[PDB]
Amino acid sequence: MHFGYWTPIYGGFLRNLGDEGMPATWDYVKKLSQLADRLGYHTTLVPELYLNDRKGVDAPSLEAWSLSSAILAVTEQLRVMTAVRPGFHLPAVTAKESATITDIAGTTEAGAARFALNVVAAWWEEEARQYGGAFTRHDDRYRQATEFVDVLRGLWEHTPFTYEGEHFSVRDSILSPKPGVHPPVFAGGESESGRDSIATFADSYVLHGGTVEEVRTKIADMNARSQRIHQRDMAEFGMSTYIIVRDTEAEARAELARITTVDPHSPGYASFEEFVKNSELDVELSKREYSVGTRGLRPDLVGTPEQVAEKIRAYQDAGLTLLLIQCSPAHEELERIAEQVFPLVP
Amino acid sequence: MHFGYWTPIYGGFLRNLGDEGMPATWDYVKKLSQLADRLGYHTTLVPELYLNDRKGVDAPSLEAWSLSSAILAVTEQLRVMTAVRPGFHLPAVTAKESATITDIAGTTEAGAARFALNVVAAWWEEEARQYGGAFTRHDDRYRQATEFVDVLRGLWEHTPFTYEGEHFSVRDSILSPKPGVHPPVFAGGESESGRDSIATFADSYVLHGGTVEEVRTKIADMNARSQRIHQRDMAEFGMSTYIIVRDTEAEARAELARITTVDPHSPGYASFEEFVKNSELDVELSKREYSVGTRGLRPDLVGTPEQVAEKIRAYQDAGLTLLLIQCSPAHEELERIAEQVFPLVP
Known part of the structure; x- marks a missing residue:
């Protein structure tokens, strides 16, 4: 079980509250990244x-x-x-940018790639209008992600590389040097049509917050698709989840109530209606499920370190290999998890 | 007189030779950047x-x-x-990327922006075919650079910002936070039609290697254009030049001969024909002028530290405020310049 976390690039993860002691500055991000490392x-x-x-x-x-x-x-x-x-x-x-970042980062002590990519869809239509992004329809959305990854892979292995497609196309392209260890491709998308395409282009899978049975079912389904396409299981499985660990379960449950206290004028839910409309997920999201992220509280990793470790161990047995933890304040909470939960989860 | 340098991203600057003890790796770039800093x-x-x-x-x-x-x-x-x-x-x-880099970098001791942009034209047509770039020519090339800078400036000052153009267009775009000190816009382009557009969108000007009279004339011409458009002189003037400093002028001139020794099988001049065709400069380049860069040896900063400092001082009086030095090996040569030439040039 690998322990990961979300980098706070928005000044926090709670849509109901404002200040979380996590400024959206490089000063805070550097301190947090160096501490977590x-x-x-x-x-x-x-x-x-x-x-x-x-x-x-x-x-x-x-x-x-x-x-x-x-x-x-x-x-x-x-x-x-x-x-x-x-x-x-x-x-x-x-x-090219990915290969240079691979060189800047190098590899871990065991020779694994220190840089990975999450192929996500542009669900926010207003953001695409503002920043000049190409908004795609869900069947062409999954085909644009396949063509994008085919060109990334093709350039990292072949010299020269040529590709022809409706969305992307390259002619006799030369990329030098190739990354030492290629960046692993992660992807998330619960559409049934998109599941087959994601199993083909991605090395590993990303999932939103879910219960132990929902995660077990979805990981098994993805491995079955990957077994029919490539004759292999997917390398890693990461779940975006929110964690609340305290000395007592009552303190943890009091903090859950504090962060789920709805403020009617909170501007955090600006993208909620657009997420519901243009994010084709199997089950539609409610306003309460969008409080800390995309079903961040659905796994319910709220309690004492022992209780939370027990829940994490059940996800490890269900097939999960990586957690993508959302915290508040992350500088204090990520240190608490490392000290109290990390030894209990082998 | 500010002393700058070219970061070696190609494993050197000499098209006639191969290895220059400057690998195109992050390991070398980090050592060089930290030393120069x-x-x-x-x-x-x-x-x-x-x-x-x-x-x-x-x-x-x-x-x-x-x-x-x-x-x-x-x-x-x-x-x-x-x-x-x-x-x-x-x-x-x-x-957005520029504003985040401004935060990562911060500012200098005097509160100046630690990040600047050089608006350069995509002269390499084969590179645009390979990496999917939009190749423009003539008034379209200079109109695309003006529209690109207008959108960069508009987003760094206004909230929301809207722009309409043939090449770029944005609708009610929101960029938050704005850079503390906006990145200064540098530009290079010797076309007579392009000179008026560059004087309008850029804060500072970049020039290729030239003589003291060529540099004095071109700096005065640019300030005259900027005075008619904005009623102000341009902030900075940088020149891309190659430097050779040695204890004796004979040693410096021996090194000049060594680097200008043409090798018939050198693959460095692959982009020379395409540079001549699609660069759009007042004077066409010869093969000998493309040996170390774009007329890097035309200023002739080759000699003893005293001789080179005397030449640098003449460029400072002509109107030049910044040098963009090309070295080989840069780790040894940039240290030599800092020790011997820097005190002689106030």
Whole structure:
């Protein structure tokens, strides 16, 4: 079980509250990344959005690729998983940028790649209008993600590489040097049609917060699809989840109530209606499920370190290999998890 | 007189030779950037090209934006001037990436911006075919650079910002937070039609290697254009030049002969014909002028520290405020310049 966390690029993760002692500045991100790297966190997910989807469109937010490159230059072992939307990027330029970031980061002590990519869809239509991104329809959305990954892979292995497609196309392209260890491709998308495409192009899978049976079922389904396409199980499985660990379960449950106290005028839910409309997920999201992220409290990792470790161990047996923890304040909470929960989860 | 230098992203600057003890790796770039920052170098120019134009298309090369972000995270005072081609970027995404890099870098002791942009044209047509860039020519090339900068400026000052143009367009776009000190816009382009557009959108000007009279005339011409458009002189003037400093002038001239020894099988001149065709400069380049860069040896800063300092002082009186020095090996040569030439040039 690898322990990861979300990098706070929006000044927090709670849509009901404002200040969480997590400023959206490089000063805070550097301190947090260096602390997590020292504590033994395996990976950090840096989401890619040019508008703050947690505190309001006008609230301060950091750019994913520049921040990711800077984090890797000031850390030693922490892997940086960076999100990427095909509609906002050229795959040939992205492949070159990724190879350079692989060199800047190097590899872990065991020779594993310190940089990964999360192929996410541009669900926010207003963000695409504002930042000039190509908004795609769900069947062509999954085909644009396949073509983008085919060009990334093709350039990292072949010299020259040529590709022809409806969304992306390259002619006799030369990329030198190739990454030492190629960045692993992670992807998330619960559409039934998209599940087959994601099983083909991605190495590992990302999932939103769910119960132990929902996670076991979805991991088994993805491995079955990957077994029919490539004759292999998927390399890693990460779940985006919110964690609340305290000395007593009553303190943990009091903090749950505090963060779920709905403020009617909170601008955090600006992107909620657009997420419901243009994020084709199997089950539609409610306003309460969008309080800390995308079903961050559904796994219910709220309690004492022993209780939370017991729940984490059940996800490990269900097939989960990585957690992508959302905290508040992350500088104090990630240290608490490292000290109290990490030894209990082998 | 501010002393700057070119970051070696192609494994050297000499098209006639191969190995220059300057590997195109982050290990070398980090050592070089940290050394230059300690020595007192003001700025470093990181060119943007996805193919190696100095050692052959298939030779190893580093990506400009990821490397620039990583350099700024590991330095304290050195400013990083990064090149940007409008045909390979979305100006709204570039404005956000630039604001985040401004936060990662912070400011110098005097409160000046540690990140600058060099608006360069996509002259390499084969590179645009390979990496999916939008190749423009003539009035479209200069109109695309004006629109790109108008969107960058508009997003850094106004909230929301709207722009309409043939190349770029944005609708009610929100960018938060704005950079503390906006990145200064540098530009290079000797076309007479392009000179008026560059004087309008850019804060400072970049020039290729030239004589003291060529530089004096061109700086005066640019300030006269800027005076008619904005009623002000341009902020800075940088010249890309190659330097050779030795204890004796005979040693310096022997090194000049060594680096200008043409090798018939050198793959460095792969982009020479395409540079001559699609660069759009007042004077066409010869093969000998493309040996170390773009007329890097035309200023002739070859000699003893006293002789080279005397020549630098004449450029300072002609109107030049910044040098963008090309070295080989840069780790030894930039230290030599800092020790011997820096005190002689006040």
